[PDB]
């Protein structure tokens, strides 16, 4: 029926708008236009802070960007300010996951900004310190496997 993490995973870079709309669940599950513009947004539930996926397309109609919030929950929410303090812009992905426990994190997005070129591949990780709504967290973005963004809110 409706949108789901499984549908999110079935959606792949390069797919057409129509392909993504179909996989996401079409009219019943997704929307385009208004403030969404040319993009597509699909929610897995009703109400505020529902989990969702957002998909954006190049001028040729091909998927270059996937984003989501809440489609996945960390296996082991456990990130600490101590871990965060041992990250720094420019560190490699290997260094990042040696400093921070990856099981405390999930993906909130991937994109190929130069699609169909695959250079500058961006991955967005969200690491929750606890279960539940609006936990303390850190965010880490990788660009071709190097840390290009780090942020934390309320970590202990």
UniProtKB/TrEMBL annotation:
UniProt KW Signal keyword: yes
Superkingdom: Bacteria
Bridged cysteine pairs (disulfide): 30-42, 105-127
Keyword Zinc assigned: no
Coiled coil: none
Keywords assigned by UniProt, alphabetized: Signal
Protein name: Beta-lactamase inhibitory protein BLIP-I precusor
């Amino acid at each position: 029926s409706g949108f789901s993490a499984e549908k999110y995973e079935q959606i792949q870079f390069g797919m057409t708008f129509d392909e993504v709309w179909e996989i996401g669940g079409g009219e019943a599950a997704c929307d385009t236009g208004g403030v969404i513009g040319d993009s597509i947004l699909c929610f897995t539930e009703s109400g505020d802070y529902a989990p969702y996926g957002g998909f954006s397309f190049t001028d040729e109609g091909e998927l270059w960007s996937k984003r989501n919030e809440y489609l996945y929950k960390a296996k082991t929410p456990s990130v600490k300010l101590s871990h965060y303090n041992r990250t720094a812009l420019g560190m490699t992905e290997a260094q990042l996951w040696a400093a921070v426990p990856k099981d405390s994190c999930v993906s909130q997005g991937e994109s190929y900004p130069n699609w169909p070129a695959k250079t500058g591949f961006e991955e967005k990780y969200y690491c929750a310190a606890a279960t539940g709504l609006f936990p303390p967290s850190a965010s880490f973005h990788l660009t071709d496997g190097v840390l290009t963004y780090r942020y934390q809110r309320s970590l202990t």
